[PDB]
Nucleic acid binder design. Structure first.
Lengths: 92, 94, 108, 78, 81, 91
DNA sequence: CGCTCAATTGGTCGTAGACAGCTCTAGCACCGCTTAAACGCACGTACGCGCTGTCCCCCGCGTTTTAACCGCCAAGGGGATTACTCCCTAGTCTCCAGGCACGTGTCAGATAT
DNA sequence: ATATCTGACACGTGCCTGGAGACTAGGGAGTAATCCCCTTGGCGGTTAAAACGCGGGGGACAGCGCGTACGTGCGTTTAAGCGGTGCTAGAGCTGTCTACGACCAATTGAGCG
């Protein structure tokens, strides 16, 4: 049975800025932690935002509010800018 | 004339859970601070003064062992850099 | 009925929205899940990953290296307080710590 | 108007906290520390209200802000 | 044979104090340092045992330490979890 | 001189690798385990993860300790000057 | 107070481990078309606990001279670092021993096809 | 009755796990000179303390509203599902080169002259 991880997607996103650059498995392990730590933070926050308003769905506006509370700076509205682009183009 | 044995406040403000800031100036304060994100809010009087309680209890938490940090430095007198010690160790400013 | 595509390809994302939907569902986080949520989440994963990897590239380049090791990511974080306010509760395994001498300790 | 946090208010708070000596240069920077604390707990609280489309800053949303720093309290609908 | 915690050597604490960025090291520090380290293991390994015993396993895994560190807030990368 | 110790700081910051000897750490870990519950075996990497997390706790404690001594007008550590950490942090 | 010269550092030899494309294999979980129930929108309609000013004393600031105090250089030796001194147990590594999931056992039957 | 299959009634090795031993030598330890650091003290140099009478604004009383609240119709949404079919990891061994070090002339530091 398989291990499950994010290695190929993090190594894909690395080419989005540094196609010149290689990776050690140890650094791959750090990024394979960082990815699902952001998942652990957001998904719980969104489920709690739903629960704080008694809802059966986590939602686009739930995750937008969770991310709005994940970083205390410009990076939050940059993340919102990427997410609004994604949900817009998916649904158009 | 000079004071002496200045303990009289210590034997009052730790005896009961009295509230120390006055309402209306704190009321405009939080409201005028909120509106730089979003104006045309309405504010529950309970919600603002609950934040007054939390700010006051947190201000006990901004002196209680902060004066112990000065005592570790062998000052009886707190100086601003003590906050820059204690509040960096708690991670609230870096 | 036709040959398939990932939802990410319509979203304009490279991250895998479908397994995000699976991880939410296997995560049991609510009775239903708005399709907008995992689509947006994939962009969080990209944007937060690319930004730190760029700085990891800087740390490696400046130390004249060509393969990333945990050191580079740790220094990439400590070069940026907007990352330090996220990762301050976190240890980067084997990256060590920021090389730092406080000025009171120096000779003369 | 941050100046509404007066000198005797901070004397009273610190004397509940058991303090002895201060140098007067403490207070004007400590007003700034309370200003950033107060601003952080406000902006987090108000967000839940406006996200829930309510315009009324709700005491629940004050609890859910303080709860994200773990500083739980009851009576306000918890 | 020696069980007496000295495996935390003078040379080890010296180097840790160095990497933490501290200078002169008076000899009183070493035994107190061993104490705080013990108390931290006695926080983490306690819950690691609860993770091992929740599965009724007989061996501690990397997951068993990682989730114990995670629930105690001093989170760790590089090992899954 | 009495002081090239400052160059030790910079050298042990050029370094990143774990500072405690492996088997010595495992002995301490097992001698905390075997009178807590019966016969705890450990996978090597779990012991290494414990070692890293704990050496990180200690490096952080000493970083705070430098602040403690320096703010107390010392460039030398003393036990009381560590002991501010346990009461100020939370434990 | 700028020199001698000892102490960390930086370019070349050469070697050897962990990446990176495997290498399709391929085992399977993402999407498509259905099936489909129900919650949250959309939306009236209840309407308080929000925003909005007169009388009235209190909450905070400015002023008295000053020392508890922090920071000063004065006084005051111990014990940590550096260094060379030896004594030892970390790491290494190869062989020991024993646990699990296995396929077919082996023969023959508790339960009923 | 019949076919057959289903636990008693069980000696056959990989993989895995952890154990314990002797040598080697990396390094912990042992001791001591002695500097440089923490230091031990008190005004002397510089500034928090209730007033004490006094100015700045908060509060017990009134007075209106579109918000904050229910809770029904319903339509849009995801759930849940099964086939088809694009994805992702195994493990096998490169093709390395990149990082790993030792050898062997640079730059950074301790002594007073």
């Amino acid at each position: 049975s398989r291990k499950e991880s994010y290695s190929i997607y993090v190594y894909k996103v690395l080419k989005q800025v540094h196609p010149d650059t290689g990776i050690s498995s140890k650094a791959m392990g750090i990024m394979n932690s960082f990815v699902n730590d952001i998942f652990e933070r957001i998904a719980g926050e969104a489920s709690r935002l739903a629960h704080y308003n008694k809802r059966s769905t986590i939602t686009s506006r739930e995750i937008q509010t969770a991310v709005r509370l994940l970083l205390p700076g410009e990076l939050a509205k940059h993340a919102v800018s990427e997410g609004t682009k994604a949900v817009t183009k998916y649904t158009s | 004339r000079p004071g002496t044995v200045a303990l009289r406040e210590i034997r009052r403000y730790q005896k009961s859970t009295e509230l120390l800031i006055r309402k209306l100036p704190f009321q405009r304060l939080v409201r005028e601070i909120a509106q730089d994100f979003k104006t045309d809010l309405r504010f529950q009087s309970s919600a603002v003064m609950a934040l007054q309680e939390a700010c006051e209890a947190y201000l006990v938490g901004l002196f209680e062992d902060t004066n112990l940090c000065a005592i570790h430095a062998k000052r009886v007198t707190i100086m601003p850099k003590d906050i820059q010690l204690a509040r960096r160790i708690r991670g609230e400013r870096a | 009925r036709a040959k398939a595509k990932t939802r990410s390809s319509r979203a304009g994302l490279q991250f895998p929205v479908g397994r995000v939907h699976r991880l939410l569902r296997k995560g049991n986080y609510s009775e239903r899940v708005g399709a907008g949520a995992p689509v947006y989440l994939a962009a969080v994963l990209e944007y937060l990953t690319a930004e730190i990897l760029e700085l990891a590239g800087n740390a490696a380049r400046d130390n004249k290296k060509t393969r990333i090791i945990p050191r580079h990511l740790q220094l990439a974080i400590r070069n940026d307080e907007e990352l330090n306010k996220l990762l301050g509760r976190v240890t980067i395994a084997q990256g060590g710590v920021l090389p730092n001498i406080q000025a009171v300790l120096l000779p003369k | 108007n941050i100046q509404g946090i007066t000198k005797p208010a901070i004397r009273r708070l610190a004397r509940r906290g058991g303090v002895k000596r201060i140098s007067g240069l403490i207070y004007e920077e400590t007003r700034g520390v309370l200003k950033v604390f107060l601003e952080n707990v406000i902006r987090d609280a108000v967000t839940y209200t406006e996200h829930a489309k309510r315009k009324t800053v709700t005491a629940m949303d004050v609890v859910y802000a303080l709860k994200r720093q773990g500083r739980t309290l009851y009576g306000f609908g918890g």
